[PDB]
Amino acid sequence: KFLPTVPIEFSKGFSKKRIDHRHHALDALVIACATTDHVNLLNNQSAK
């Protein structure tokens, strides 16, 4: 598929997530659906 792209001269200080307000809602949904198992597995509370 055709992915979004920015030329080099225009890519200084560019972010995919920063262009639209809806990335906040996306972040909220992502952080919500992660259970306590997810957080204590990605925080390596069982690594030792």
Partner: protein, 336 residues
Amino acid sequence: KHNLESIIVSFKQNLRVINKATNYYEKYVEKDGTKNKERVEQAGTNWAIRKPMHKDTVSGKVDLPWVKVPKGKILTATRKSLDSSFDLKSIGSITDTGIQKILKNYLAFKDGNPELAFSPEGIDDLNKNIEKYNDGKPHQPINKVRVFELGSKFQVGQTGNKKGKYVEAAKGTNLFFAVYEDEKGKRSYETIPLNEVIERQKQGLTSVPLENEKGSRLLFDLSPNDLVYVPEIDENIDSNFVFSNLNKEKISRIYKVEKTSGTECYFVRQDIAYLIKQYDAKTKIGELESQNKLQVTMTDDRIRITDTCVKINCDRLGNINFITKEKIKQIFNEFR
């Protein structure tokens, strides 16, 4: 995907123009026969203005017969210091004709070059030898001159000499954009400056007059960061309601106000946070045109927003409010 593409972005707004004023001041009051100091509330109706009413600079009105005055426009004046920034064009903006003559003659005496003519040394030389350039007539020294300007300015107040001082609205105080409708079908656009809004609100009226001098009924008023809907070309509609199940396209056809100037209201799509490329006037290429704003929709149809836009009010959670069979019943129940 569905939920994310079906989101309306909610913008907090604060249109505070006037508010109730709280004044706790201490004075002597009599209780049980003894007089003691205590703080009391202010009695009556006190209004606090919640916006910078005008700019700091104060100008005075003048009447120069030798200048054409456009209708509905005011000619004012203000003192300014004489410096190198004055050229033959600038001297034409000085109220006093004799000063213009003397100043032009001295400037010509020094090769028409303001840098040496209007340096402090040049000012001293002119002041110490003002006789030559004033036809030999005496003249009081010159340090400042009252340059005149042409524009839209209003008096500071009414009581005292506050009617003799003319100012202009503070930057960012253009917060209202009225759209009126006539029975013919034509939409009229206007911008209401702040001071009329303060006056109307103090009178207890609404912020925007409900009909302009055309007699046209007021469709709606616009403030920065409110949402309007632009219908399709083939979907010419009056209100369209159906604001409970807007699809991807309906939501994608929502725009937001930022800047109002004159009869111009500038819009950006509601979900656009930051442009991919900031517009450059030199290369004239970017996501949005000059000022990074469009009076017209981004899509290829490029239809002007103010012609067909319909205001929509959105609560905190993103829902759209519209009148229903129940809100009227609560309206009547509130008074019974």
